[PDB]
Amino acid sequence: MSAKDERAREILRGFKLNWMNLRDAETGKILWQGTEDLSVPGVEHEARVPKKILKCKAVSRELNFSSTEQMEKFRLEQKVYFKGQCLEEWFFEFGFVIPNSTNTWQSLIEAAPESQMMPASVLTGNVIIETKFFDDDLLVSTSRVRLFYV
Ligand SMILES: *C(=N\C)/C(CCCN(CC1CCCCC1)S(=O)(=O)c1ccc(S(=O)(=O)N(Cc2ccc(Cl)cc2)C2CCCC2)cc1)=C(/C)O
C-alpha cells in the first residue's frame, strides 16, 4: 500500500452520511428522505422513490455529512445504470471540508434534454446508482443503490 491508499481509508473511516433528501426543483415538494448511509461501500443498498420523480424537470438533493478528516476537493461521480448499461453520468463538487465538520450539500440534478425516460414500471428494480466519493483524484469509496419506483 501507498500513502494515498492509507489516506483514502482514513477519510472513509471518518466519513458518515447522516441524512439526505430529494425535492422537485420547480415546486420544492419533498419526494424522498432517508437517514440510511447509502454511501457505505460493499453492500447493495435499496431505495424506493415515488414514480412521479421521473416527470420532474429537475431534482434538488440535500445531503448532510460529517468528516473527521480534512478534504481539499471533496466531490462525487454518479453513474446511472439500467440493466448494467450506463445511461447518465453526473458530477458534483463540494470543495474544501473542515476536519471534524458536519455539512449540508445542496445539488441540482437536471434531466438530460437529449433523452426520454422509460416508464417507471420498466425501470423499477433495474436501475443501479454507482456513486464514487473522491477527494480530488483520490478515490475514497464506491457504493451502489438499487432504485424502485413506487
Ligand atoms: C436515464 N435518463 C436518460 C434514467 C433516469 C433516472 C434518473 N433519475 C431521474 C431524475 C434525475 C434528474 C431529473 C429528473 C429525473 S431518478 O429519479 O431515478 C434519480 C434521482 C436521484 C438520484 S440520487 O440523488 O443520485 N440518489 C442516489 C444516491 C446514492 C448515493 C448518494 Cl451518496 C447520494 C444519492 C437518490 C435516489 C434515491 C435515494 C437517493 C438517483 C436517481 C435512468 C435510470 O437510466
Q: Find all residues with CB under 8 Å of 53, minimum gap 6, and list them.
A: 22, 24, 31, 32, 59, 149
3-state secondary structure of 55: helix
Task: Give burial (CB, 10 Å; 0-12/13-18/19+) of 56.
Answer: buried
Gapped junctions in the chain, after residues (C–N > 2.5 Å): none
Rounded to the nearest 10°, the torsion over CA 123, 50, 33, 47 is -30
Beta carbons within 10 angstroms of residue 83's beta carbon: 10
Strand 71-82 relative to strand 58-67, pairing: unpaired
Number of domains in the chain: 1
Domain that holds residue 69: 1-150
Beta carbons within 10 angstroms of residue 76's beta carbon: 18
Is there an atom of ligand 1 within 6 Å of 126 CB? no
If you search the block for the grid coordinates 416527470, which residue do you land on? 55
Cell digits of residue 41: 461501500
Instruction: Identify how many contiguous H helices and E strands the chain contains and give both numbers.
Output: 2, 9
Is there an atom of ligand 1 within 6 Å of 120 CB? no
Give the technique used to solve this structure. Answer: X-ray
CATH number at residue 45: 2.70.50.40
Strand 44-49 relative to strand 138-149, pairing: parallel
Contact 42, 142 (CB under 8 A): no
Nearest-5° angle of CA 85, CA 108, CA 131?
Answer: 40
* Phi then psi dihedrals of residue 77, to 5 deg: -115, 130
Rounded to the nearest 10°, the torsion over CA 117, 123, 31, 129 is -100
CA nearest ligand 1 atom 24, residue:
61
CA atoms within 13 A on the CB side of 107: 17
Is there an atom of ligand 1 within 6 Å of 31 CB? no
Atom of ligand 1 nearest to the CA of 145: 29
Does an H or E element contain 121, and which?
Answer: helix 120-123
Nearest-5° angle of CA 123, CA 42, CA 58?
Answer: 40
Cell digits of residue 28: 420544492
Atom of ligand 1 nearest to the CA of 34: 38
From the list 145, 149, 118, the residue with the least C-alpha distance to 37 is 145
